[PDB]
Symmetry: D2
Subunit: 237 residues, 4 copies
Amino acid sequence: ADTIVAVELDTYPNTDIGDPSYPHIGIDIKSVRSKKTAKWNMQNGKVGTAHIIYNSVDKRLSAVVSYPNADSATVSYDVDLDNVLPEWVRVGLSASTGLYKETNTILSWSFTSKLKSNSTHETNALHFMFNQFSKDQKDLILQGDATTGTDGNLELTRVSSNGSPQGSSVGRALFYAPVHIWESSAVVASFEATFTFLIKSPDSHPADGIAFFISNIDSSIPSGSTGRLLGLFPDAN
Amino acid sequence: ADTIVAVELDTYPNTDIGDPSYPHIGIDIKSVRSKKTAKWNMQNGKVGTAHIIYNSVDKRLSAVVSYPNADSATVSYDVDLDNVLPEWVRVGLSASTGLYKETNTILSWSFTSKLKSNSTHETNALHFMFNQFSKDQKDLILQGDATTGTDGNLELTRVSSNGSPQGSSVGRALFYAPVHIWESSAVVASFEATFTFLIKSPDSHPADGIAFFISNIDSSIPSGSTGRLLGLFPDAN
Amino acid sequence: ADTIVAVELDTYPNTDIGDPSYPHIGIDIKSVRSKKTAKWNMQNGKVGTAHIIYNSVDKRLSAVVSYPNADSATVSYDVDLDNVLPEWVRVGLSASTGLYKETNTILSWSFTSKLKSNSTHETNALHFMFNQFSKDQKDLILQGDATTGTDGNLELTRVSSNGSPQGSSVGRALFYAPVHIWESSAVVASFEATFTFLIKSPDSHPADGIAFFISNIDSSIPSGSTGRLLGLFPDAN
Amino acid sequence: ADTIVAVELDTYPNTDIGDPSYPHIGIDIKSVRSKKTAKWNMQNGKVGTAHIIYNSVDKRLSAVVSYPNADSATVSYDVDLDNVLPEWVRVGLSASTGLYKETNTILSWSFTSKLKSNSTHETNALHFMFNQFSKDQKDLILQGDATTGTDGNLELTRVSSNGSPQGSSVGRALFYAPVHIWESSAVVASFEATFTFLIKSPDSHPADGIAFFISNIDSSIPSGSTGRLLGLFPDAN
Ligand SMILES: O=C(NCCO[C@H]1O[C@H](CO)[C@@H](O)[C@H](O)[C@@H]1O)c1ccc(-c2cccc(-c3ccc(C(=O)NCCO[C@H]4O[C@H](CO)[C@@H](O)[C@H](O)[C@@H]4O)cc3)c2)cc1
Ligand SMILES: O=C(NCCO[C@H]1O[C@H](CO)[C@@H](O)[C@H](O)[C@@H]1O)c1ccc(-c2cccc(-c3ccc(C(=O)NCCO[C@H]4O[C@H](CO)[C@@H](O)[C@H](O)[C@@H]4O)cc3)c2)cc1
Ligand SMILES: [Ca+2]
Ligand SMILES: [Ca+2]
Ligand SMILES: [Ca+2]
Ligand SMILES: [Ca+2]
Ligand SMILES: [Mn+2]
Ligand SMILES: [Mn+2]
Ligand SMILES: [Mn+2]
Ligand SMILES: [Mn+2]
């Protein structure tokens, strides 16, 4: 079983597995049942922005999602990620559709991790930034339905030629390089992630959402993780 | 008077103004009487490192002080710096000596500020890094006894040719450029400050310490601020 | 007088002071008479981008100007900026109007300077980024008609409420902080400047242009520098 | 046959294949026979620093190597790398020993690549930094004799337990992630690489050197590329 830490942008209320009634953002530690959620007024057809942040000093994982000219949704959770994740991980974006559907379009993605040592008092750092995605993006591991190059975007879930999202769809993009996320010898470990997204539905009911996630480096899409499981979890436990 | 937010590396217990019995790190919000302290095993004559981090999501000022192959002292305080600081500030380093004395030597200093905005959705940023200080450092405002250029270091307080620190000394260094520290239109404001320092005392009693501080742009050394007030405060209220 | 190094986006051929017959980009070293120019197909009313890059290894000032879906204009000049500029400078943007007029609108501006040193072997750096300008931007020195805050843009030259650019206007914006541009103890000095701009003229004859410039720290708009001198030079020598 | 672009730190004069009489730095475009060389006073047992830089505007590949308190060696060569390398590459460090030997110790390595588009006018960027290396460094592809974790360094060539370098040795470290080094749609492509190194010999004759290199992503150590071929080339052509 993969080890997963995620921020979910959850557009569809699965009230039988702990979702609230409304679209929401959440912090998932090893379960689709968010440890903490906040209400989120997803805006259909509009470009949004997620900022995620962590440091080893506060051990607080925080996410902010916003649209131009709207109040933000933010959620926070105290978690020592040295006790949850392995030392080496991969970072990625995940999305799914079920019975109901939406485009899961990423327009940009950027990430920064830092280790600042006690042993030496010197820093190890990874930073990547995509504002365009190309038809053949060799620093990305695309899983399931995920594709790149259509209008320089990353389409996480399946979309027809006229541009209609398909249901029962799942897809993920991971950064090729493993990331050293925590280290005993570090005085401060920090990571930042930012992405922009276009979730468009023809339905008045979009599903299922987008997640930024951290996994074991060999993470793959769990079997039957379309719909409410967001390509992250094998089950709703 | 000046408006001050500070992290103090305080080497001298002034127990009649709320100091603990031991050298401590402290978060000061408009008062030398730290809202929060932690024990700090300052190591006479060694190069130490200070990391300060704030973000407008967690609203939590944190400091970590460390030497090679020792435990860290860390201290944190929940505070909304929108309700304490004016929108525009200067950042600096202050130090002091009283009856008792120490080198207050700064070997390097870096600082990073970001506003990432709502309604606009476009980031403003400032970052500077000093790994050596020159004899005439025109992007630093030197106050009091603060000098630059000797071993390419910043000496906050007065030192002899023969290496001896003087008492009743006080000095500060401010980054020339004002800093946009918070904005009501920003979804995430954050900042990071790192400095390395060498505190050496010929006595078994070093005084008084070093602080990173954020002030009103026209901040100057208050009268009588030598020793226990660290160049930061006019009195001990 | 002031010491000036500049890249000019020059929209008006002043053929009696060495200008080519066409709108051009130019590298100016202590003279409005560009040491080097290239043809530039300035696009009335579009957002353009300017990239300037220098390094003390190649000793080569290069500029690239581009619009979406057009060819770049690029210009380069071998010059040792240790023999032209004082050790400490300010960086800025200048613009001008004469008989003829244009918006000189700056939408964003970023700058990066590094000294990486010998005998010391430790890097000094400054970086600032403006993706929006506020009504009161305390890290910019505004000279002449330069204003900020309207559409969160920097208007170098005078514009009406009704959107109309005025003639015989001149304006500049300088980064507040002085910049350590070269050091004799550095193995590699380098810098990078990026700005996006919108030049709109109601006539089929726009004038006069925008420049990124590096000056002595106390640089001010020379007398009579409107129109063809671009706020940079007192005369056309 | 791999496609290779390298900066060599060449400690041993192979005068039969175009080496000068003395230790030297060089730019290798698809041949061990440097297109351009400069004299280099390698300092045995001392920590050195290499800075490599390129941009698509100058199409000039430049390298600077220096020690504390010594004059630098620099070399430059005009090369359009869009005409030499594939669009996607891996970056790495390479070193070899032959009949004669040296430690090929890397203490730190950092890299930055940038693409800034015409199609969009938005940037794609990779930056990594190692100041420590760990016993198990999963963002590095180690080939041949290369090992990590001994004193937090990367040993490129084989060294005994007492710390004696072995001859007929070859080794390479590549960044796990493929790098998008050039792109038609880019107005400026730039890359920076920096590393620090300790070359120590017991001999008064060290060999064979260190190289920073760019290759096709599947690059491997050519057969018999110990000695003068630096783990880069199958032959001296
Ligand atoms: O009937 C049951 N459970 C069985 C009976 O269990 C009790 O009695 C037993 C016998 O005595 C005993 O053994 C046991 O312990 C119990 O005492 C049952 C049925 C429904 C629910 C339920 C509760 C609350 C909410 C829901 C719910 C279901 C479905 C949705 C929904 O929106 N469905 C559409 C989703 O379809 C797909 O598409 C979306 C969007 O694309 C995806 O998210 C999704 O993954 C799908 O692909 C909402 C709410 C049901 C409880 C118990
Ligand atoms: O004798 C020849 N060539 C054959 C004769 O060729 C001529 O005549 C033929 C018959 O008529 C005709 O067919 C042909 O066309 C010719 O007209 C020959 C021998 C030597 C050289 C030569 C020239 C200049 C310099 C050198 C040279 C050799 C070796 C070194 C050196 O330093 N050697 C030690 C290196 O050993 C190892 O270790 C180092 C350091 O670790 C590594 O770098 C190296 O890889 C090894 O592992 C220096 C200089 C020889 C030309 C022609
Ligand atoms: Ca859900
Ligand atoms: Ca005290
Ligand atoms: Ca002109
Ligand atoms: Ca050689
Ligand atoms: Mn949910
Ligand atoms: Mn105190
Ligand atoms: Mn001109
Ligand atoms: Mn050579």
